Design a protein around this ligand. Structure first.
Ligand SMILES: *[C@@H]1O[C@H](CO)[C@@H](O)[C@H](O)[C@H]1NC(C)=O
Ligand SMILES: *[C@@H]1O[C@H](CO)[C@@H](O)[C@H](O)[C@H]1NC(C)=O
Ligand SMILES: *[C@@H]1O[C@H](CO)[C@@H](O)[C@H](O)[C@H]1NC(C)=O
Ligand SMILES: *[C@@H]1O[C@H](CO)[C@@H](O)[C@H](O)[C@H]1NC(C)=O
Ligand SMILES: *[C@@H]1O[C@H](CO)[C@@H](O)[C@H](O)[C@H]1NC(C)=O
Ligand SMILES: *[C@@H]1O[C@H](CO)[C@@H](O)[C@H](O)[C@H]1NC(C)=O
Ligand SMILES: [Ca+2]
Lengths: 49, 49, 480, 480
């Protein structure tokens, strides 16, 4: 769901048409951790990480 | 892992299509960390977002 | 002589109560409620979920204007007659629309601010915050009519407003709409087509008024939308139900007679006060029952003066009744009505406090007054420290949480929030999600210190002196 | 000895408690809640979300009459859903009708108010607020039947209602509906065609009753819709269950014996009071328990008289259960049932309070009672001042926020809002926006003064009294 949000409200906001003084293009730095995440097994919906 | 969102609203769309074309956000990542700055000259204030 | 003054004070109380009984008429809250529900609650569109109270962008304002606004203004013509030409609109089949609504805006000048030279390439346009010294006074766009030409404050017969962000002047670029929906909509569409609300606009006002001939009570409606320099939209509104045709019924004659009696009472009170001060007790101020008297007299004189000023200056209604196809300017009357209401409210509040002078009849009521009088000095002495610590906490909260919480955005708001915390009317959420450290610390320390130490100290101060007074009186009675 | 009077009082309390538990019954609340959900929550039509609780226009009221009303009044027990081999928990309202419902309207006449001559060229119709002297008593429209002809209160067996705005009389233009849906709908459509709710209408009542055929309790339903003179719609409802069939099993025959025992107890108390008032200490009203048994006796006499009246009027209901060609007038029965319930609740409360006289045996309870009785004059004396300040603040709030808050709309509403503020149940979102100045000042000064000074003084009075009583009772012992 991040991509529709970025395409709808982010990109028209950063570029715009004579609006939104930006002062530097945005960035999308991400961390990898190089390990496949295990999906949460069903249960009481634990609130841990 | 940084990724710049182009310079204008003509290549940023292609950059996105690349990013979800080659599973940039696979099932290993942890965060996306979208970050940008803003400037308001009327009040002369910057804003880190 | 504890009886000549008691009777004339009960008479004053009766006159004042009669005066405020007709001033605060019934079936008036419902009128304002219906108007507010009609205008501030109807969604801007059938497919939209936003109303005037939750406007979020300049595009939403255009949707509201040519939309939920015209629906509530120009109601149906209830066709049962000839309908010769452009029949008038009754808002609820009972509320007549007087004259024609007016819209206007206040904007700023392109060359207002001064952007730094470091990045003077990517920044081309800039508009400073609203101020009189930074206002646009030149034609813009299609300089054709009165919506694209500046017109001074003296020419609009306007005045300041004191909105939320700043105090807006009475001038600006205005336009008077039409009496029918099919023409007002065309005018608004023409305004929207060639851009009227640019990025340099700072405020927008919409004004009109209604009559409701059933119960003779005018109502002036004003809606303001503020565009701050940092972006966004701030809405505000007011609905003032004022009256201008008082003497229509016998009850109004009774109210006028009561007002005359009140004026005579005030004259008698000021004469007796000046007679007392002229010869007896040239100091006169060490009693706490004479400062109240002068406060009451001053407030009543101010109220009478305001009432005379706003009752003699009703020529706007006479001017409007000549040509009924023009905007009726009824803002000064509403402002003065609000001021008079405030003055009357505070005067009525202080009279009941003055009533305390006479409840000393029996012995069991003398000791309570004695205790209060004896402990007032110490209560003030400790209240000084209480307020100092309270203001220190308020300023700390304002400086720390004042940019993210929306409950500490202003010093006054900080004070109100800290009074509400004592009530147990706080959520404990925005403080902690504002800052996980120094967030709960402030709350815990404030609650502990304030509640325990200061509330118990007030209790101790009152209890000790009450017990001392009671014991002294008991000993004196038993030894005599 | 006091043991015999203790036994008699406990027997009386047991009789009263068992009688109240018997008359309270059960599952009446569920019946009332199902009635409310059926007649109030369902939308008027599948294309709209406006139920009866949220009426806002005359057309909505007209839509309700053919919509939620009929769809829910004529055998809405349809088990077309997934019922488990029987009627489910929700569907238990077969609800056979007791004859025909009645509709009635109250309206005023054109010219009840005089418009000013300045606007007289612009306005022609003036309809005043509802009043007995301004009511319309003339035929209108197709003057053919009872729906277009005024009928006096005597000819209609009506009574006052005391609605939300005003108190409506029992006269008006009335129509008796029919038994079957497809003809009642036709009658209502004919009423809607020839306009029946003009601009002069001020109130509309709908009345009917049901039996439910399986739990043995009638239900009287009244629905009021009143249109203020300022435009709008105000709805209200009244559902009252009744149980006058009180001889079915052996359980309810025991209540007759309980009533006989209660009557004997009341007679014994009356004769005891009248014998003790005369010979022993004529005008003995100095004490508290002496002035408390009179209240209990009077309230019980009123309750038994009301019950006798209800029993006498029971016969007016039973004679027509197989007849469904006349409107059943059950309003008086419901009103007197409510009165009886209120009287019974109050007298039970006072009987329970009377128990405090007997638990004064040991030193602890006697000391507590002595402390409680000693701090009675002081508490009343200080409560006088507390309520003087409370009423001053309430009047100030009424004058300031009386038109645009809805918590200070009326004086009693101001008092209750202040009492809730003491509990910290304030909104403060509307108080600040109603008046940016003089609004927060009210809140801050009220909270500070009220809590600190007045609560500390109330605590101090009781604390000092308790200390003095304990010291006195300690000194009087071990000193003789
Ligand atoms: C506003 O002024 C700047 C320079 O001060 C100029 O570049 C820009 O074109 C102006 N905009 C308008 C609409 O006049
Ligand atoms: C501008 O004024 C002319 C005057 O002849 C008028 O014809 C035209 O419609 C106007 N244009 C507007 C108001 O947009
Ligand atoms: C302002 O006051 C003048 C003076 O009477 C009046 O002629 C005019 O119509 C008023 N309104 C405007 C918009 O000028
Ligand atoms: C109401 O009464 C006034 C009094 O003359 C009359 O002029 C007007 O036509 C009446 N209106 C209706 C609808 O009867
Ligand atoms: C009025 O007269 C009777 C009611 O007494 C009714 O049957 C008839 O249809 C009515 N006439 C009109 C025109 O509604
Ligand atoms: C009012 O009561 C009398 C009593 O006999 C009855 O005849 C009459 O029908 C009642 N009124 C109505 C409208 O039913
Ligand atoms: Ca007794």
């Amino acid at each position: 769901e991040l991509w529709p949000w970025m395409a709808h409200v982010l990109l028209p906001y950063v570029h715009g048409n004579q609006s939104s003084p930006e002062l530097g293009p945005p960035r999308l730095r991400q961390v990898r951790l190089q390990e496949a995440l295990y999906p949460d097994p069903p249960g009481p919906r634990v609130h841990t990480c | 892992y940084v990724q710049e969102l182009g310079l204008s609203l003509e290549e940023s769309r292609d950059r996105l299509r690349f990013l979800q074309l080659h599973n940039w956000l696979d099932n290993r990542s942890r965060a996306v960390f979208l970050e940008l700055t803003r400037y308001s000259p009327a009040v002369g204030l910057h804003a880190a977002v | 002589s504890v009886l000549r003054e008691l009777v004339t004070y009960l008479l004053f109380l009766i006159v004042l109560c009669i005066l405020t009984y007709g001033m605060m008429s019934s079936n008036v809250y419902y009128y304002t409620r219906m108007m507010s529900q009609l205008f501030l609650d109807t969604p801007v569109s059938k497919t939209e979920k936003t109303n005037f109270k939750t406007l979020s962008s300049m595009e939403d304002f255009w949707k509201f204007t040519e939309g939920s606004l015209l629906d509530g203004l120009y109601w149906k013509m209830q066709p049962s007659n000839q309908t010769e030409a452009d029949n008038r609109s009754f808002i609820f089949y009972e509320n007549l629309l007087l004259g024609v609504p007016r819209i206007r805006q206040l904007r700023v000048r392109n060359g207002s601010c001064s952007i730094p030279q470091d990045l003077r390439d990517e920044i081309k346009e800039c508009y400073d915050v609203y101020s009189v010294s930074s206002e646009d006074r030149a034609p813009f766009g299609p300089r054709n009519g009165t919506a694209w030409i500046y017109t001074s404050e003296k020419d609009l017969n306007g005045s300041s407003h004191w909105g939320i962000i700043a105090t807006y002047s009475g001038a600006g670029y205005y336009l008077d709409l039409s009496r029918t929906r099919e023409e007002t909509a065309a005018q608004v569409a023409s305004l929207k087509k060639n851009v009227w609300l640019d990025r340099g606009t700072r405020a927008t006002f919409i004004d009109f008024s209604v009559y409701n001939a059933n119960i003779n009570l005018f109502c002036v409606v004003r809606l303001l939308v503020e565009f701050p320099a940092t972006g966004g939209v701030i809405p505000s509104w007011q609905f003032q139900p004022l009256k201008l045709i008082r003497y229509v019924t016998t009850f109004d004659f009774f109210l006028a007679a009561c007002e005359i009696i009140f004026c005579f009472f005030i004259f008698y009170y000021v004469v007796e006060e000046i007679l007392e001060i002229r010869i007896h007790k040239l100091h006169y101020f060490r009693s706490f029952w004479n400062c109240l008297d002068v406060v009451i007299v001053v407030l009543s004189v101010v109220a009478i003066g305001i009432n005379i000023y706003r009752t003699s200056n009703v020529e706007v209604l006479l001017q409007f009744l000549e040509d009924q196809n023009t905007f009726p300017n009824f803002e000064h009357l509403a402002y003065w009505q609000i001021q008079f209401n405030n003055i009357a409210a505070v005067t009525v509040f202080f009279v009941w406090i003055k009533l305390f002078k006479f409840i000393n009849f029996n012995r069991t009521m003398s000791q309570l007054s004695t205790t209060m009088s004896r402990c007032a000095k110490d209560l003030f002495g400790f209240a000084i420290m209480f307020f100092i610590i309270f203001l220190a906490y308020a300023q700390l909260a304002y400086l720390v949480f004042g940019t993210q919480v929306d409950d500490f955005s202003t010093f006054q708001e900080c004070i109100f929030t800290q009074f509400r915390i004592i009530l147990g009317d706080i959520n404990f959420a925005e403080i902690e999600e504002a800052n996980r450290v120094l967030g709960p610390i402030y709350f815990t320390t404030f609650v502990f210190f304030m509640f325990f130490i200061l509330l118990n100290m007030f209790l101790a101060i009152i209890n000790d002196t009450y017990s001392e007074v009671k014991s002294d009186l008991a000993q004196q009675k038993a030894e005599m």
